[PDB]
Amino acid sequence: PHRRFEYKYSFKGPHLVQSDGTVPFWAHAGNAIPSADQIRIAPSLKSQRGSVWTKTKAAFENWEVEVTFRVTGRGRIGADGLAIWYTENQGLDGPVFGSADMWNGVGIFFDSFDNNPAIVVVGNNGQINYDHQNDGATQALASCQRDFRNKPYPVRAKITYYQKTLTVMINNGFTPDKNDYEFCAKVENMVIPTQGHFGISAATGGLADDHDVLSFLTFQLTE
């Protein structure tokens, strides 16, 4: 299956951030801190929320995103985690891993163990007022249990929307190999908006990890 790299929906270092503090093609918000090699979406301070979203919408029948990130913090517990998004609108701040509680599209949530370790796929058609704590278990379309914190190498999520199936593959941070992925979850017959923004958001609470995204690479898939 053919992949075309879509620069207008992507970011990576080196020199990720412009001299003016912006990241080409994206908007950062909240407590997100662009730096040369990564964007620290939510730092290890109390009650943080941040995000990075594409400034334009993509209209890809099929697509794939490769997101490389780290979630780093003290102890065996941390919070909150991060979310990868494809939604009709350009997301704004809220209580769902730093983003708003309603959306039209899909979120893939990486929820840190704070005593569930989980990666969860959650759809929304614009009608659900989502509260992760209350609704995650019941509304998850699919999930897997992986611990993505404090790993030796960057964690890599590959989220593919191809032939109406949304698949989540994960490299859980034990190899530097940008292509060594294992299956996490898939959702068949997923309907998502024909056009939408890509995004990534994170948050902290009383417990707080540093949530860093090193790169977000978007590909348009063809057949």
Side-chain angles (χ1 to χ4, degrees), residues 71-75 77-107:
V71 179
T72 308
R74 88 171 175 186
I77 52 178
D80 287 11
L82 65 87
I84 298 167
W85 301 97
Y86 169 78
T87 61
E88 187 159 53
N89 310 96
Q90 190 187 321
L92 296 171
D93 59 283
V96 184
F97 302 97
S99 197
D101 60 9
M102 310 189 83
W103 63 94
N104 180 23
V106 64

PDB file of all heavy atoms in Angstrom, residues 71-107, unseen atoms left out:
ATOM      1  N   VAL A  71       7.034   9.686  27.611  1.00  0.00           N
ATOM      2  CA  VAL A  71       6.305  10.114  28.800  1.00  0.00           C
ATOM      3  C   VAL A  71       7.223   9.753  29.956  1.00  0.00           C
ATOM      4  O   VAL A  71       7.507   8.579  30.197  1.00  0.00           O
ATOM      5  CB  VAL A  71       4.933   9.438  28.961  1.00  0.00           C
ATOM      6  CG1 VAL A  71       4.241   9.916  30.217  1.00  0.00           C
ATOM      7  CG2 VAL A  71       4.042   9.705  27.753  1.00  0.00           C
ATOM      8  N   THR A  72       7.745  10.769  30.624  1.00  0.00           N
ATOM      9  CA  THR A  72       8.836  10.589  31.584  1.00  0.00           C
ATOM     10  C   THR A  72       8.474  11.178  32.913  1.00  0.00           C
ATOM     11  O   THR A  72       8.001  12.306  33.003  1.00  0.00           O
ATOM     12  CB  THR A  72      10.094  11.297  31.078  1.00  0.00           C
ATOM     13  OG1 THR A  72      10.371  10.888  29.738  1.00  0.00           O
ATOM     14  CG2 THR A  72      11.339  10.908  31.890  1.00  0.00           C
ATOM     15  N   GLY A  73       8.698  10.421  33.973  1.00  0.00           N
ATOM     16  CA  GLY A  73       8.383  10.939  35.279  1.00  0.00           C
ATOM     17  C   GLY A  73       8.880  10.052  36.373  1.00  0.00           C
ATOM     18  O   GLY A  73       9.456   8.999  36.139  1.00  0.00           O
ATOM     19  N   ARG A  74       8.605  10.493  37.582  1.00  0.00           N
ATOM     20  CA  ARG A  74       9.125   9.819  38.738  1.00  0.00           C
ATOM     21  C   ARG A  74       8.220   8.671  39.155  1.00  0.00           C
ATOM     22  O   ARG A  74       7.023   8.655  38.877  1.00  0.00           O
ATOM     23  CB  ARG A  74       9.335  10.840  39.851  1.00  0.00           C
ATOM     24  CG  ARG A  74       8.150  11.091  40.736  1.00  0.00           C
ATOM     25  CD  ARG A  74       8.512  11.951  41.937  1.00  0.00           C
ATOM     26  NE  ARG A  74       7.351  12.300  42.750  1.00  0.00           N
ATOM     27  CZ  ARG A  74       7.392  13.130  43.781  1.00  0.00           C
ATOM     28  NH1 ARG A  74       8.533  13.700  44.122  1.00  0.00           N
ATOM     29  NH2 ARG A  74       6.293  13.398  44.474  1.00  0.00           N
ATOM     30  N   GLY A  75       8.830   7.681  39.786  1.00  0.00           N
ATOM     31  CA  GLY A  75       8.111   6.529  40.291  1.00  0.00           C
ATOM     32  C   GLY A  75       7.432   5.612  39.293  1.00  0.00           C
ATOM     33  O   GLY A  75       7.641   5.668  38.070  1.00  0.00           O
ATOM     34  N   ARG A  76       6.595   4.748  39.851  1.00  0.00           N
ATOM     35  CA  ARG A  76       5.837   3.793  39.080  1.00  0.00           C
ATOM     36  C   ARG A  76       4.449   4.346  38.777  1.00  0.00           C
ATOM     37  O   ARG A  76       3.622   3.640  38.228  1.00  0.00           O
ATOM     38  CB  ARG A  76       5.731   2.467  39.837  1.00  0.00           C
ATOM     39  N   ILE A  77       4.183   5.592  39.151  1.00  0.00           N
ATOM     40  CA  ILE A  77       2.898   6.212  38.822  1.00  0.00           C
ATOM     41  C   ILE A  77       3.147   7.566  38.211  1.00  0.00           C
ATOM     42  O   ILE A  77       4.073   8.268  38.592  1.00  0.00           O
ATOM     43  CB  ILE A  77       1.990   6.408  40.055  1.00  0.00           C
ATOM     44  CG1 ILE A  77       2.735   7.149  41.168  1.00  0.00           C
ATOM     45  CG2 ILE A  77       1.443   5.086  40.535  1.00  0.00           C
ATOM     46  CD1 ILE A  77       1.866   7.402  42.390  1.00  0.00           C
ATOM     47  N   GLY A  78       2.290   7.945  37.275  1.00  0.00           N
ATOM     48  CA  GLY A  78       2.395   9.237  36.640  1.00  0.00           C
ATOM     49  C   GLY A  78       1.036   9.620  36.097  1.00  0.00           C
ATOM     50  O   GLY A  78       0.086   8.842  36.147  1.00  0.00           O
ATOM     51  N   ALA A  79       0.928  10.825  35.564  1.00  0.00           N
ATOM     52  CA  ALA A  79      -0.340  11.287  35.013  1.00  0.00           C
ATOM     53  C   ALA A  79      -0.082  12.464  34.076  1.00  0.00           C
ATOM     54  O   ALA A  79       0.939  13.137  34.218  1.00  0.00           O
ATOM     55  CB  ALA A  79      -1.290  11.705  36.127  1.00  0.00           C
ATOM     56  N   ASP A  80      -0.981  12.750  33.129  1.00  0.00           N
ATOM     57  CA  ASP A  80      -2.223  12.001  32.856  1.00  0.00           C
ATOM     58  C   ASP A  80      -2.015  11.048  31.687  1.00  0.00           C
ATOM     59  O   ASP A  80      -2.555   9.945  31.623  1.00  0.00           O
ATOM     60  CB  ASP A  80      -3.342  12.946  32.388  1.00  0.00           C
ATOM     61  CG  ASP A  80      -3.936  13.813  33.486  1.00  0.00           C
ATOM     62  OD1 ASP A  80      -3.403  13.887  34.608  1.00  0.00           O
ATOM     63  OD2 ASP A  80      -4.974  14.484  33.279  1.00  0.00           O
ATOM     64  N   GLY A  81      -1.269  11.538  30.709  1.00  0.00           N
ATOM     65  CA  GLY A  81      -1.058  10.849  29.465  1.00  0.00           C
ATOM     66  C   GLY A  81      -1.271  11.776  28.293  1.00  0.00           C
ATOM     67  O   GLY A  81      -1.290  13.000  28.430  1.00  0.00           O
ATOM     68  N   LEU A  82      -1.371  11.164  27.125  1.00  0.00           N
ATOM     69  CA  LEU A  82      -1.494  11.930  25.912  1.00  0.00           C
ATOM     70  C   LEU A  82      -2.489  11.333  24.976  1.00  0.00           C
ATOM     71  O   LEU A  82      -2.842  10.163  25.074  1.00  0.00           O
ATOM     72  CB  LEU A  82      -0.138  12.110  25.262  1.00  0.00           C
ATOM     73  CG  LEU A  82       0.659  10.960  24.707  1.00  0.00           C
ATOM     74  CD1 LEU A  82       0.279  10.674  23.274  1.00  0.00           C
ATOM     75  CD2 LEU A  82       2.135  11.355  24.778  1.00  0.00           C
ATOM     76  N   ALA A  83      -2.927  12.152  24.033  1.00  0.00           N
ATOM     77  CA  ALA A  83      -3.923  11.757  23.066  1.00  0.00           C
ATOM     78  C   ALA A  83      -3.511  12.168  21.663  1.00  0.00           C
ATOM     79  O   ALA A  83      -2.989  13.253  21.469  1.00  0.00           O
ATOM     80  CB  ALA A  83      -5.268  12.418  23.414  1.00  0.00           C
ATOM     81  N   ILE A  84      -3.782  11.287  20.710  1.00  0.00           N
ATOM     82  CA  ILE A  84      -3.581  11.558  19.290  1.00  0.00           C
ATOM     83  C   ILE A  84      -4.971  11.663  18.699  1.00  0.00           C
ATOM     84  O   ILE A  84      -5.839  10.851  18.993  1.00  0.00           O
ATOM     85  CB  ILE A  84      -2.734  10.457  18.619  1.00  0.00           C
ATOM     86  CG1 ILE A  84      -1.329  10.417  19.261  1.00  0.00           C
ATOM     87  CG2 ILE A  84      -2.718  10.669  17.109  1.00  0.00           C
ATOM     88  CD1 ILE A  84      -0.515   9.199  18.912  1.00  0.00           C
ATOM     89  N   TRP A  85      -5.151  12.652  17.843  1.00  0.00           N
ATOM     90  CA  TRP A  85      -6.474  12.991  17.341  1.00  0.00           C
ATOM     91  C   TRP A  85      -6.536  13.143  15.831  1.00  0.00           C
ATOM     92  O   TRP A  85      -5.607  13.646  15.198  1.00  0.00           O
ATOM     93  CB  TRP A  85      -6.851  14.362  17.875  1.00  0.00           C
ATOM     94  CG  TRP A  85      -6.900  14.522  19.346  1.00  0.00           C
ATOM     95  CD1 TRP A  85      -5.922  15.023  20.144  1.00  0.00           C
ATOM     96  CD2 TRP A  85      -8.008  14.236  20.199  1.00  0.00           C
ATOM     97  NE1 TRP A  85      -6.351  15.052  21.449  1.00  0.00           N
ATOM     98  CE2 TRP A  85      -7.629  14.576  21.506  1.00  0.00           C
ATOM     99  CE3 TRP A  85      -9.272  13.710  19.993  1.00  0.00           C
ATOM    100  CZ2 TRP A  85      -8.469  14.415  22.588  1.00  0.00           C
ATOM    101  CZ3 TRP A  85     -10.109  13.565  21.081  1.00  0.00           C
ATOM    102  CH2 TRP A  85      -9.704  13.921  22.347  1.00  0.00           C
ATOM    103  N   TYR A  86      -7.671  12.748  15.267  1.00  0.00           N
ATOM    104  CA  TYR A  86      -8.071  13.146  13.921  1.00  0.00           C
ATOM    105  C   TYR A  86      -9.529  13.589  14.095  1.00  0.00           C
ATOM    106  O   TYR A  86     -10.395  12.758  14.379  1.00  0.00           O
ATOM    107  CB  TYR A  86      -7.942  12.035  12.868  1.00  0.00           C
ATOM    108  CG  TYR A  86      -8.609  12.412  11.574  1.00  0.00           C
ATOM    109  CD1 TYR A  86      -8.010  13.272  10.683  1.00  0.00           C
ATOM    110  CD2 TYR A  86      -9.877  11.945  11.267  1.00  0.00           C
ATOM    111  CE1 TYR A  86      -8.652  13.646   9.505  1.00  0.00           C
ATOM    112  CE2 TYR A  86     -10.518  12.315  10.098  1.00  0.00           C
ATOM    113  CZ  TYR A  86      -9.900  13.165   9.225  1.00  0.00           C
ATOM    114  OH  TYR A  86     -10.532  13.542   8.062  1.00  0.00           O
ATOM    115  N   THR A  87      -9.782  14.884  13.982  1.00  0.00           N
ATOM    116  CA  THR A  87     -11.126  15.407  14.228  1.00  0.00           C
ATOM    117  C   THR A  87     -11.473  16.491  13.232  1.00  0.00           C
ATOM    118  O   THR A  87     -10.606  17.184  12.711  1.00  0.00           O
ATOM    119  CB  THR A  87     -11.231  15.985  15.668  1.00  0.00           C
ATOM    120  OG1 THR A  87     -10.310  17.067  15.844  1.00  0.00           O
ATOM    121  CG2 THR A  87     -10.875  14.948  16.720  1.00  0.00           C
ATOM    122  N   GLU A  88     -12.761  16.667  12.968  1.00  0.00           N
ATOM    123  CA  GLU A  88     -13.190  17.687  12.025  1.00  0.00           C
ATOM    124  C   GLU A  88     -12.661  19.071  12.359  1.00  0.00           C
ATOM    125  O   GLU A  88     -12.245  19.815  11.476  1.00  0.00           O
ATOM    126  CB  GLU A  88     -14.702  17.757  11.978  1.00  0.00           C
ATOM    127  CG  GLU A  88     -15.190  18.683  10.884  1.00  0.00           C
ATOM    128  CD  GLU A  88     -16.610  18.376  10.520  1.00  0.00           C
ATOM    129  OE1 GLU A  88     -17.428  18.346  11.445  1.00  0.00           O
ATOM    130  OE2 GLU A  88     -16.899  18.127   9.329  1.00  0.00           O
ATOM    131  N   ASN A  89     -12.696  19.416  13.638  1.00  0.00           N
ATOM    132  CA  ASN A  89     -12.286  20.734  14.089  1.00  0.00           C
ATOM    133  C   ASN A  89     -10.875  20.710  14.621  1.00  0.00           C
ATOM    134  O   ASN A  89     -10.334  19.647  14.963  1.00  0.00           O
ATOM    135  CB  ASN A  89     -13.265  21.230  15.167  1.00  0.00           C
ATOM    136  CG  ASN A  89     -14.694  21.105  14.713  1.00  0.00           C
ATOM    137  OD1 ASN A  89     -15.370  20.126  15.023  1.00  0.00           O
ATOM    138  ND2 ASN A  89     -15.143  22.071  13.916  1.00  0.00           N
ATOM    139  N   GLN A  90     -10.297  21.899  14.688  1.00  0.00           N
ATOM    140  CA  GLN A  90      -9.007  22.074  15.310  1.00  0.00           C
ATOM    141  C   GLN A  90      -9.245  22.180  16.802  1.00  0.00           C
ATOM    142  O   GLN A  90      -9.859  23.137  17.270  1.00  0.00           O
ATOM    143  CB  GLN A  90      -8.333  23.316  14.764  1.00  0.00           C
ATOM    144  CG  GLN A  90      -6.907  23.442  15.188  1.00  0.00           C
ATOM    145  CD  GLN A  90      -6.324  24.761  14.779  1.00  0.00           C
ATOM    146  OE1 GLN A  90      -6.608  25.261  13.688  1.00  0.00           O
ATOM    147  NE2 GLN A  90      -5.543  25.352  15.661  1.00  0.00           N
ATOM    148  N   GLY A  91      -8.808  21.169  17.539  1.00  0.00           N
ATOM    149  CA  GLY A  91      -9.119  21.060  18.947  1.00  0.00           C
ATOM    150  C   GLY A  91      -8.579  22.159  19.808  1.00  0.00           C
ATOM    151  O   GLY A  91      -7.559  22.782  19.519  1.00  0.00           O
ATOM    152  N   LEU A  92      -9.319  22.389  20.884  1.00  0.00           N
ATOM    153  CA  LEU A  92      -8.988  23.373  21.882  1.00  0.00           C
ATOM    154  C   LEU A  92      -8.949  22.683  23.235  1.00  0.00           C
ATOM    155  O   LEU A  92      -9.164  21.477  23.347  1.00  0.00           O
ATOM    156  CB  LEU A  92      -9.982  24.536  21.857  1.00  0.00           C
ATOM    157  CG  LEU A  92      -9.951  25.324  20.544  1.00  0.00           C
ATOM    158  CD1 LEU A  92     -11.100  26.321  20.487  1.00  0.00           C
ATOM    159  CD2 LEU A  92      -8.627  26.064  20.293  1.00  0.00           C
ATOM    160  N   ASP A  93      -8.631  23.464  24.252  1.00  0.00           N
ATOM    161  CA  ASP A  93      -8.327  22.941  25.565  1.00  0.00           C
ATOM    162  C   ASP A  93      -9.506  22.333  26.268  1.00  0.00           C
ATOM    163  O   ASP A  93     -10.650  22.726  26.046  1.00  0.00           O
ATOM    164  CB  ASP A  93      -7.799  24.073  26.401  1.00  0.00           C
ATOM    165  CG  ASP A  93      -8.780  25.192  26.516  1.00  0.00           C
ATOM    166  OD1 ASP A  93      -8.924  25.967  25.546  1.00  0.00           O
ATOM    167  OD2 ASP A  93      -9.474  25.373  27.534  1.00  0.00           O
ATOM    168  N   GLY A  94      -9.220  21.356  27.115  1.00  0.00           N
ATOM    169  CA  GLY A  94     -10.233  20.704  27.909  1.00  0.00           C
ATOM    170  C   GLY A  94      -9.667  19.589  28.750  1.00  0.00           C
ATOM    171  O   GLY A  94      -8.457  19.428  28.860  1.00  0.00           O
ATOM    172  N   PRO A  95     -10.566  18.823  29.345  1.00  0.00           N
ATOM    173  CA  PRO A  95     -10.232  17.784  30.314  1.00  0.00           C
ATOM    174  C   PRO A  95      -9.921  16.414  29.760  1.00  0.00           C
ATOM    175  O   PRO A  95      -9.707  15.490  30.531  1.00  0.00           O
ATOM    176  CB  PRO A  95     -11.493  17.745  31.172  1.00  0.00           C
ATOM    177  CG  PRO A  95     -12.578  17.991  30.163  1.00  0.00           C
ATOM    178  CD  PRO A  95     -12.023  18.978  29.196  1.00  0.00           C
ATOM    179  N   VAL A  96      -9.879  16.271  28.445  1.00  0.00           N
ATOM    180  CA  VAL A  96      -9.602  14.978  27.857  1.00  0.00           C
ATOM    181  C   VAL A  96      -8.169  14.985  27.342  1.00  0.00           C
ATOM    182  O   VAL A  96      -7.885  15.368  26.212  1.00  0.00           O
ATOM    183  CB  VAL A  96     -10.616  14.633  26.764  1.00  0.00           C
ATOM    184  CG1 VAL A  96     -10.378  13.256  26.224  1.00  0.00           C
ATOM    185  CG2 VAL A  96     -12.037  14.752  27.333  1.00  0.00           C
ATOM    186  N   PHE A  97      -7.253  14.571  28.211  1.00  0.00           N
ATOM    187  CA  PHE A  97      -5.825  14.623  27.900  1.00  0.00           C
ATOM    188  C   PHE A  97      -5.434  15.975  27.328  1.00  0.00           C
ATOM    189  O   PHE A  97      -4.664  16.047  26.375  1.00  0.00           O
ATOM    190  CB  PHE A  97      -5.415  13.442  27.019  1.00  0.00           C
ATOM    191  CG  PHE A  97      -5.718  12.139  27.655  1.00  0.00           C
ATOM    192  CD1 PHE A  97      -6.868  11.460  27.353  1.00  0.00           C
ATOM    193  CD2 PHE A  97      -4.873  11.612  28.616  1.00  0.00           C
ATOM    194  CE1 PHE A  97      -7.187  10.280  27.975  1.00  0.00           C
ATOM    195  CE2 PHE A  97      -5.183  10.418  29.242  1.00  0.00           C
ATOM    196  CZ  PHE A  97      -6.332   9.742  28.911  1.00  0.00           C
ATOM    197  N   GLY A  98      -5.948  17.038  27.949  1.00  0.00           N
ATOM    198  CA  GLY A  98      -5.650  18.406  27.573  1.00  0.00           C
ATOM    199  C   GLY A  98      -6.563  19.027  26.535  1.00  0.00           C
ATOM    200  O   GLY A  98      -6.452  20.230  26.302  1.00  0.00           O
ATOM    201  N   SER A  99      -7.430  18.215  25.928  1.00  0.00           N
ATOM    202  CA  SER A  99      -8.306  18.658  24.850  1.00  0.00           C
ATOM    203  C   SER A  99      -9.777  18.648  25.266  1.00  0.00           C
ATOM    204  O   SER A  99     -10.165  18.068  26.280  1.00  0.00           O
ATOM    205  CB  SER A  99      -8.080  17.765  23.628  1.00  0.00           C
ATOM    206  OG  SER A  99      -8.585  18.369  22.458  1.00  0.00           O
ATOM    207  N   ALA A 100     -10.603  19.245  24.413  1.00  0.00           N
ATOM    208  CA  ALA A 100     -12.020  19.428  24.717  1.00  0.00           C
ATOM    209  C   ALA A 100     -12.787  18.135  24.859  1.00  0.00           C
ATOM    210  O   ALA A 100     -12.415  17.106  24.296  1.00  0.00           O
ATOM    211  CB  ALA A 100     -12.645  20.283  23.651  1.00  0.00           C
ATOM    212  N   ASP A 101     -13.888  18.208  25.590  1.00  0.00           N
ATOM    213  CA  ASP A 101     -14.678  17.025  25.889  1.00  0.00           C
ATOM    214  C   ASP A 101     -15.668  16.578  24.834  1.00  0.00           C
ATOM    215  O   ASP A 101     -16.324  15.568  25.016  1.00  0.00           O
ATOM    216  CB  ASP A 101     -15.389  17.169  27.230  1.00  0.00           C
ATOM    217  CG  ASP A 101     -16.328  18.342  27.282  1.00  0.00           C
ATOM    218  OD1 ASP A 101     -16.604  18.995  26.258  1.00  0.00           O
ATOM    219  OD2 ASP A 101     -16.866  18.670  28.355  1.00  0.00           O
ATOM    220  N   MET A 102     -15.734  17.284  23.715  1.00  0.00           N
ATOM    221  CA  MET A 102     -16.493  16.815  22.572  1.00  0.00           C
ATOM    222  C   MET A 102     -15.647  17.013  21.328  1.00  0.00           C
ATOM    223  O   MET A 102     -14.905  17.972  21.209  1.00  0.00           O
ATOM    224  CB  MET A 102     -17.810  17.562  22.369  1.00  0.00           C
ATOM    225  CG  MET A 102     -18.676  17.670  23.588  1.00  0.00           C
ATOM    226  SD  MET A 102     -20.316  18.346  23.173  1.00  0.00           S
ATOM    227  CE  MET A 102     -21.112  16.925  22.647  1.00  0.00           C
ATOM    228  N   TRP A 103     -15.828  16.112  20.387  1.00  0.00           N
ATOM    229  CA  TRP A 103     -15.148  16.186  19.115  1.00  0.00           C
ATOM    230  C   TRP A 103     -15.949  15.375  18.114  1.00  0.00           C
ATOM    231  O   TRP A 103     -16.824  14.586  18.494  1.00  0.00           O
ATOM    232  CB  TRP A 103     -13.706  15.635  19.225  1.00  0.00           C
ATOM    233  CG  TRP A 103     -13.603  14.167  19.591  1.00  0.00           C
ATOM    234  CD1 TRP A 103     -13.497  13.119  18.736  1.00  0.00           C
ATOM    235  CD2 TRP A 103     -13.618  13.597  20.908  1.00  0.00           C
ATOM    236  NE1 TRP A 103     -13.417  11.939  19.426  1.00  0.00           N
ATOM    237  CE2 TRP A 103     -13.489  12.203  20.768  1.00  0.00           C
ATOM    238  CE3 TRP A 103     -13.696  14.127  22.197  1.00  0.00           C
ATOM    239  CZ2 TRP A 103     -13.456  11.348  21.861  1.00  0.00           C
ATOM    240  CZ3 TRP A 103     -13.661  13.275  23.271  1.00  0.00           C
ATOM    241  CH2 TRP A 103     -13.552  11.905  23.102  1.00  0.00           C
ATOM    242  N   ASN A 104     -15.619  15.564  16.844  1.00  0.00           N
ATOM    243  CA  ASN A 104     -16.197  14.796  15.757  1.00  0.00           C
ATOM    244  C   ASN A 104     -15.021  14.101  15.071  1.00  0.00           C
ATOM    245  O   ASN A 104     -14.309  14.704  14.282  1.00  0.00           O
ATOM    246  CB  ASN A 104     -16.965  15.696  14.788  1.00  0.00           C
ATOM    247  CG  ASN A 104     -17.562  14.920  13.656  1.00  0.00           C
ATOM    248  OD1 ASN A 104     -17.788  13.716  13.775  1.00  0.00           O
ATOM    249  ND2 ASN A 104     -17.768  15.586  12.522  1.00  0.00           N
ATOM    250  N   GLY A 105     -14.823  12.842  15.426  1.00  0.00           N
ATOM    251  CA  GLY A 105     -13.729  12.060  14.890  1.00  0.00           C
ATOM    252  C   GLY A 105     -13.229  11.064  15.904  1.00  0.00           C
ATOM    253  O   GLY A 105     -13.991  10.508  16.687  1.00  0.00           O
ATOM    254  N   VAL A 106     -11.923  10.856  15.927  1.00  0.00           N
ATOM    255  CA  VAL A 106     -11.348   9.811  16.763  1.00  0.00           C
ATOM    256  C   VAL A 106     -10.201  10.321  17.617  1.00  0.00           C
ATOM    257  O   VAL A 106      -9.420  11.163  17.176  1.00  0.00           O
ATOM    258  CB  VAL A 106     -10.884   8.620  15.901  1.00  0.00           C
ATOM    259  CG1 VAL A 106      -9.752   9.031  14.965  1.00  0.00           C
ATOM    260  CG2 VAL A 106     -10.500   7.408  16.745  1.00  0.00           C
ATOM    261  N   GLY A 107     -10.144   9.823  18.844  1.00  0.00           N
ATOM    262  CA  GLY A 107      -9.014  10.029  19.722  1.00  0.00           C
ATOM    263  C   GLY A 107      -8.403   8.696  20.089  1.00  0.00           C
ATOM    264  O   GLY A 107      -9.107   7.704  20.263  1.00  0.00           O
TER     265      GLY A 107
END
